[PDB]
Amino acid sequence: GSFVEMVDNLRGKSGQGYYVEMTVGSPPQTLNILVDTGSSNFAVGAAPHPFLHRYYQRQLSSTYRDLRKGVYVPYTQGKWEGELGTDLVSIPHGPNVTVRANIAAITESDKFFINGSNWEGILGLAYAEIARPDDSLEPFFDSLVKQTHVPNLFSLQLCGAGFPLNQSEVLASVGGSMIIGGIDHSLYTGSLWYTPIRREWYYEVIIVRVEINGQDLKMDCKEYNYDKSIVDSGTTNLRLPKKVFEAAVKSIKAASSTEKFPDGFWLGEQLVCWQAGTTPWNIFPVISLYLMGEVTNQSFRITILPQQYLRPVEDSQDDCYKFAISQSSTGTVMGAVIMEGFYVVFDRARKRIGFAVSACHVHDEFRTAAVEGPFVTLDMEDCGYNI
Ligand SMILES: CN1C(=N)N[C@@]2(c3cc(-c4cccc(C#N)c4)cs3)CN(c3ncc(F)cn3)C[C@H]2C1=O
Numbered sequence: 001g002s003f004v005e006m007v008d009n010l011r012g013k014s015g016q017g018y019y020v021e022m023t024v025g026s027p028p029q030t031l032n033i034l035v036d037t038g039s040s041n042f043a044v045g046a047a048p049h050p051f052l053h054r055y056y057q058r059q060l061s062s063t064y065r066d067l068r069k070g071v072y073v074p075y076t077q078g079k080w081e082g083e084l085g086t087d088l089v090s091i092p093h094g095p096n097v098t099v100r101a102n103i104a105a106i107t108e109s110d111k112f113f114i115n116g117s118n119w120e121g122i123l124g125l126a127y128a129e130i131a132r133p134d135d136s137l138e139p140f141f142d143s144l145v146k147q148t149h150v151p152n153l154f155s156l157q158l159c160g161a162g163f164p165l166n167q168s169e170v171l172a173s174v175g176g177s178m179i180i181g182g183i184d185h186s187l188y189t190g191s192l193w194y195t196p197i198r199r200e201w202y203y204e205v206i207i208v209r210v211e212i213n214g215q216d217l218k219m220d221c222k223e224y225n226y227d228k229s230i231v232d233s234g235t236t237n238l239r240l241p242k243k244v245f246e247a248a249v250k251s252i253k254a255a256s257s258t259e260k261f262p263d264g265f266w267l268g269e270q271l272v273c274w275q276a277g278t279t280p281w282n283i284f285p286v287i288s289l290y291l292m293g294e295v296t297n298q299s300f301r302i303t304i305l306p307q308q309y310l311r312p313v314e315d316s317q318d319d320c321y322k323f324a325i326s327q328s329s330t331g332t333v334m335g336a337v338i339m340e341g342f343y344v345v346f347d348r349a350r351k352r353i354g355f356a357v358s359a360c361h362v363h364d365e366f367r368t369a370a371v372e373g374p375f376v377t378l379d380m381e382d383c384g385y386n387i
Pocket residue numbers: 014015016017018034036037038039040041073075076077112114122130131132232233234235236336
């Protein structure tokens with residue numbers, strides 16, 4: 001329906017992540033928290049750090065409970081270590097509830113906190129299977145659903161501005177909405193189409209066909225989900241398995257061949273700039289991902305524009321961008337490139353993910369992002385990877 005208290009409760013941008021305000025402890029300590037559908041721990045800075053101006057002070061919370069257990073979370077780009085405990089947590093622009101949740105109090109970190117970023121912790125919204133140290137550490141959303149009458153569903157509208165936001169603008173701008181326990185109809189246009197959650201660990205999905213400007217990439221569909229395909233608000237790019245990335249970039253280069261770009265642009269390293277207002281959107285192709293439908297032998301497609309996969313960056317008055325499609329050795333990641341085009345419904349209760357055209361997606365007068373269906377697609381379970 002309508003969840004006016006939760007609409008426009010996010011801030012941020014794809015390169016720095018999107019965050020929501022939360023409170024921890026008694027009296028409440030306000031912190032900004034990165035919204036991550038790609039992990040399952042609620043973890044906050046709990047010790048001074050040069051890039052933090054606030055942190056969780058456990059000794060000032062009367063409701064703090066020590067779990068007497070450490071947690072070490074190393075990952076590819078960095079790591080954090082901390083001490084497990086529980087406390088009362090609320091979301092000021094959220095459901096009007098307070099819950100007792102697990103909190104990893106971060107005491108040591110490496111390349112986790114970012115200078116200039118305005119967030120102090122991370123909210124892992126995925127399932128217990130991938131929580132650290134193990135699946136016995138109940139994730140925040142699981143606690144929220146168990147302790148209250150909040151429906152087992154949340155939805156995200158991540159809003160890319162379509163232009164770079166400076167240090168002050170990114171603080172004052174609306175980055176989107178996280179609707180906890182519902183679907184807000186003002187955030188999308190057209191119909192919502194649902195794809196099954198394949199398995200409850202990451203938000204895993206199955207891609208059954210890929211097109212670049214309507215041209216079938218024509219790969220064995222297992223390649224698109226090798227070794228998994230996930231929906232991740234904590235990844236900036238659309239990341240594709242090595243072989244898929246190679247085929248996609250060849251096709252995108254062919255479609256945009258009226259303009260030659262350096263190898264560094266396609267590697268996501270180098271920016272490309274055009275005179276103000278002259279970005280040649282029309283030379284770049286649309287990209288469609290077909291996802292398994294809820295009905296046997298049925299699929300639907302989501303289509304994004306170069307306004308989604310060319311990330312605006314500051315150089316001058318030129319309009320500059322980085323190519324935000326990159327290679328993966330851990331499967332497809334539908335990051336903020338995908339998510340900024342759509343309103344995404346994480347329907348945990350019905351084990352499905354919904355997509356609709358976002359009311360805040362960036363487009364031009366000639367093309368728009370799309371969510372369309374149905375299409376007849378056979379042997380879609382064969383597209384899923386095993387082992
Ligand atoms: C892609 N991705 C995440 N989705 N989450 C993680 C992080 C994302 C960010 C981050 C920072 C800035 C911008 C963006 C965006 N968009 C994301 C910092 S840490 C957490 N994680 C993880 N893994 C295993 C585990 F038991 C617990 N946490 C893996 C990290 C990661 O590389």
